């Protein structure tokens, strides 16, 4: 027949999977004027995107929510955003001093205010003091009568965070650099892995508020009007149960103690702060959930927990194991840290709740062992309403307990749709044509 | 090189015979001497505030050069200076008459006349001509 | 307070279509390939350094500035058992670049040193008359 010759094409719409660098592209309003928002790092890239979207309608791309790289690039960056911000603030090495702590006039908690001699920046004469110290940060030392010492002296350094900054979790949109198209599944029956039907293409991902909480997920993002629950093997016992429920469950948590301002001794140009006085009467902080909807919720969960084996033996159980930082429910609220007891939330089922919250001050970094941030609060009481669009469970009559040791799994619940592919725009094909040759 | 920014469009094409006043030639006679290797005779001696800024300066010298070659490259007008196309001008873009655009007008005012409409003209060259002619050329090689 | 439907095409919009329908679409994937706390800058060079390579390989092949062009390198039927009209009417590009992935290095050497190197020593010596 005819002779065929190769023919070069450019801009051919193909891709392979690649692992490249994405970049922050945040909000850009009210970042100026004292907003030292540590998530924004003063509005990281000021884009405020217009997230357009192109449907492709003939494309099947075999996704995977479990071998995704985008969740790995967050957990690199978030502690990396801490580490530059943890640097210039005040170091707290010279404070690990033996104490004399007595009972405070209006349980185990704030009973002990303390006193110790220190000579930080004057470097001439020591001076005793008065502070306010909770539990969960002190140790009654040996061979002495009522003498305390901070729990994390002989770890790495105990640098605090500065009061200019704010940990306010504004939504961050991950955009893609040139030559990379972030894709997104358009099937809401997407169970986590496998193929999709009519994958689209966005410039930039949707709202991701990088909140930090164990055992739940607060200001999250929720699917349509079925409850979807995904996991890795979903038969294996030591995996993580990602729960996406179709409605929100409203939460109130408050700190009724009128904590105030304060003046503690100065480092070298470094004023250090330790929580000033309460107004004179102590009410212990608590979360406060509308317990009807929560009771309504968990029977709705075993509707969709069930349909992978039989029609029998569903229960709910509370957590277990170790010190209360991994036991009790952890989350932040506006420059303040909460460890709340959540044993009441996990009664079993069949086919207004007040929770005792606990607050500490010396708080470990989230995954590294070693350094640890620190922040005394601002004046007044604290209130933050919130939401719930998910929780983290484990397998163990088939026992479900609230597990959790990685908020990447929270970010896996946020990024269960996305995939970044590089363009290989050059391509060739044969036809009958031929270059003119003389 | 901006010597005729107050001249008119019907007259600025006269002095544009010089290579846009040797436009790109000023870059190569710069980067021959921007690439004075005294930067390599020091390794900058450190990382300094200026070398951070020079690095962010050379990138924009790279990128914004390419965005003007690529658009000339895609328009079937690679490397030339005055090329015609096959796209018919639509009077909805500008209802100015002929001589007013050329004889009686600056350049930068004419930018603000069609800075709205500019992006539509970009697509209406490629998908109308340079996407289009390549298929019709390849049909004329089928025989 | 805006919004209208699609007019021309989208980005990667032809990537589920056939070759005969995607061949009239190449400009949209051609424009936006380049334009789009140090870690933005490390992206802004890789996006350049990938663009030059694809630009350079078109330059060597006598095919710079054109979107498509032909050569005189013969297609070898050992590379593809696919019939002709199946390729231009049934197969998408994303599938097509898994099928000729292995042969790609043989192709690029057999364009330059085969023809466009040879079309210059032949070209330079068509003088003297």
């Amino acid at each position: 027949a005819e002779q065929l010759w190769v023919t070069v094409y450019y801009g051919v719409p193909v891709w392979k999977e690649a692992t490249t660098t994405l970049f922050c592209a945040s909000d850009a309003r009210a970042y100026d004027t004292e907003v030292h928002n540590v998530w924004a790092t003063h509005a990281c890239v000021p884009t405020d995107p217009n997230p357009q979207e192109v449907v492709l309608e003939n494309v099947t791309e075999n996704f995977n929510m479990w071998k995704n790289n985008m969740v790995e690039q967050m957990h690199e960056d978030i502690i990396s955003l801490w580490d530059q911000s943890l640097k210039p603030c005040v170091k707290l090495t010279p404070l690990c001093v033996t104490l004399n702590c007595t009972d405070l006039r209006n349980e185990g908690g704030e009973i002990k205010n303390c006193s110790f001699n220190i000579t930080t920046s004057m470097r001439d004469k020591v001076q005793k003091e008065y502070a306010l110290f909770y539990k969960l940060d002190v140790v009654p030392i040996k061979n002495d009568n009522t003498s305390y010492r901070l729990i994390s002296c002989n770890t790495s350094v105990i640098t605090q965070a500065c009061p200019k900054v704010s940990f306010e979790p504004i939504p961050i949109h991950y955009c893609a650099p040139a030559g990379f198209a972030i894709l997104k599944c358009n099937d809401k029956k997407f169970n986590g892995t496998g193929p999709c039907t009519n994958v689209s293409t966005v410039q930039c991902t949707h709202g991701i508020r990088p909140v930090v909480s164990t055992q739940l997920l607060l200001n999250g993002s929720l699917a349509e009007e079925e409850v979807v629950i995904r996991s890795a093997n979903f038969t294996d016992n030591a995996k993580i149960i990602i729960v996406q429920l179709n409605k929100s469950v409203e939460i109130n948590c408050t700190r009724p103690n009128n904590n105030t301002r304060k003046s503690i001794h100065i480092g070298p140009g470094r004023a250090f702060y330790t929580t000033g006085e309460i107004i004179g009467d102590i009410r212990q902080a608590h979360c406060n959930i509308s317990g009807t909807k929560w009771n309504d919720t968990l029977k709705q969960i075993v509707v969709k927990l069930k349909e992978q084996f039989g029609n029998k033996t569903i229960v709910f159980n509370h957590s277990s194991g170790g010190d209360p930082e991994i036991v009790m429910h952890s989350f932040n609220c506006g420059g303040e840290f909460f460890y709340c007891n959540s044993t009441q939330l996990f009664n079993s089922t069949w086919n207004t709740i007040v929770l005792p919250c606990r607050i500490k001050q010396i708080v470990n970094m989230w995954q590294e062992v070693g350094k640890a941030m620190y922040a005394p609060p601002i004046k007044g009481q604290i209130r933050c309403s919130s939401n719930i669009t998910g929780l983290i469970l484990i397998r163990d009559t088939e026992i479900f307990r609230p597990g959790g040791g990685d908020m990447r799994d929270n970010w896996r619940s946020e990024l269960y749709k996305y995939k970044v592919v590089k363009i290989e725009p050059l391509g060739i094909a044969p036809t009958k044509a031929k270059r003119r040759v003389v | 090189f901006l010597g005729a920014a107050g001249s008119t469009m019907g007259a600025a094409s006269m002095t544009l015979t010089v290579q846009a006043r040797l436009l790109l030639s000023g870059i190569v006679q710069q980067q021959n001497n921007l690439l004075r290797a005294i930067e390599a005779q020091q390794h900058l001696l450190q990382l300094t505030v200026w070398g951070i800024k020079q690095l962010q300066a050379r990138v924009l010298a790279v990128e914004r050069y390419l965005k003007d070659q690529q658009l000339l490259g895609i328009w079937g007008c690679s490397g030339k200076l005055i090329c015609t196309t096959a796209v018919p001008w639509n009077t909805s873009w500008s209802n100015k008459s002929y001589n007013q655009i050329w004889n009686n007008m600056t350049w930068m005012e004419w930018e603000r006349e069609i800075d709205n409409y500019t992006s539509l003209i970009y697509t209406l060259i490629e998908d109308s001509q340079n996407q289009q002619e390549k298929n019709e050329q390849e049909l004329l090689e089928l025989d | 307070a805006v919004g209208i439907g699609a007019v021309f095409l989208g980005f990667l919009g032809a990537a589920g279509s056939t070759m005969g329908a995607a061949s009239m679409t190449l400009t949209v994937q051609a424009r936006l390939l380049l334009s789009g706390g140090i870690k933005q800058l490390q992206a802004r060079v890789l996006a350049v350094e990938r663009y030059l390579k694809d630009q350079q390989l078109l330059g060597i092949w006598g095919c710079s500035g054109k979107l498509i062009c032909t050569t005189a390198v013969p297609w070898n039927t050992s590379w593809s058992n696919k019939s002709y009209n199946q390729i231009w009417n049934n197969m998408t590009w994303m599938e097509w670049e898994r099928e000729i992935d292995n042969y790609t290095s043989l192709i690029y050497t057999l364009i330059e040193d085969s023809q466009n190197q040879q079309e210059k020593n032949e070209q330079e010596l068509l003088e003297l008359d």
């Epitope: 410039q203 | - | 209208i4 936006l32």
Partner: antibody, heavy 134, light 109 residues
Framework: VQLVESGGGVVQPGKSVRLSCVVS????????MYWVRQAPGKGLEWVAA????????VYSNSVQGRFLVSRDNVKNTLYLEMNSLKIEDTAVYRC????????????????????????????WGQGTTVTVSS | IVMTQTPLSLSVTPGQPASISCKSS???????????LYWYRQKPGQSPQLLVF???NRFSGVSDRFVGSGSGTDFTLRISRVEAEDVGFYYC?????????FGGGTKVD
């Protein structure tokens, strides 16, 4: 400038009329228009909107599909035709001009889709009134 | 979206400052760099007239004592030394997206 309407009055259910707002002096093809509905003793309800080139039309959900709007930039007219009339449509209609100027449609590069900008109103016509009853 | 306001009735006499705020459910900040909230006034029996278009700027034929401000959700219109002819209603009108709604219109006597 001068901004009034015409064709108002009173009709039955199931009927169909068309008003006529006429502008005076500004270049009419440059600007988009609107329609608003103040019920007697109530607030205001937005009705409709046309682009400047008469290409983009956005209706309220309640009156969706029933009404009709159009432009004639040469005759400088503005029409609100209506169909399938109900008694609760009895209110004051007002013809109204956008405050700002609008541009031509935009055509974002990344997706071949135009964009017509829409902002609010400054010049309300005094407007007619249509009553739907027996 | 939803956007109501408060208080409905402020039956006053001239000589004092006050303010009327309109409360937003969806936050307003368009990508142009501005917040499309338009405050204006009708008189009884009349088609309305524009008080201020943006929450910052004003309109022609407007006394200087008409000041407005607000965040993306909080929105406030303040009238210093409330004038004798401030009768009728005051509608808060937003221009985020469609259908663009109103407030009820605060009556001031």
């Amino acid at each position: 400038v001068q901004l009034v309407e015409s064709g108002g009055g009173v009709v039955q259910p199931g009927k169909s009329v068309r008003l006529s707002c006429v502008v005076s002096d500004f270049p009419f093809s440059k600007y988009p228009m609107y329609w608003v509905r103040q019920a007697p003793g109530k607030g205001l309800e937005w009705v409709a909107a046309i682009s400047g080139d008469a290409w983009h039309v956005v209706y309220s959900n309640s009156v969706q599909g029933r009404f009709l709007v159009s432009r004639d930039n040469v005759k400088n007219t503005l029409y609100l035709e209506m169909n399938s009339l109900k008694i609760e449509d009895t209110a004051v209609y007002r013809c109204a001009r956008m405050f700002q100027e609008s541009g031509p449609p935009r055509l974002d590069r990344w997706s071949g889709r135009n964009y017509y900008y829409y902002s609010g109103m400054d010049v309300w016509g005094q407007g007619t009134t249509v009553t739907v009853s027996s | 979206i939803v956007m109501t306001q408060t208080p409905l009735s402020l039956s006053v006499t001239p000589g004092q400052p006050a303010s009327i705020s309109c409360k937003s459910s969806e936050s307003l900040r368009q990508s142009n760099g501005k917040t499309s909230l338009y405050w204006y006034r009708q008189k009884p029996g009349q088609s309305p007239q524009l008080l201020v278009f943006e929450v910052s700027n004003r309109f022609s034929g407007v006394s200087d004592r008409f000041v407005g401000s607000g965040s993306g959700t909080d929105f406030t219109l303040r009238i210093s030394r409330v004038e004798a002819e401030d009768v009728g209603f005051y509608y808060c009108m937003q221009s985020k997206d469609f259908p663009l709604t109103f407030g009820g219109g605060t009556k001031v006597d």
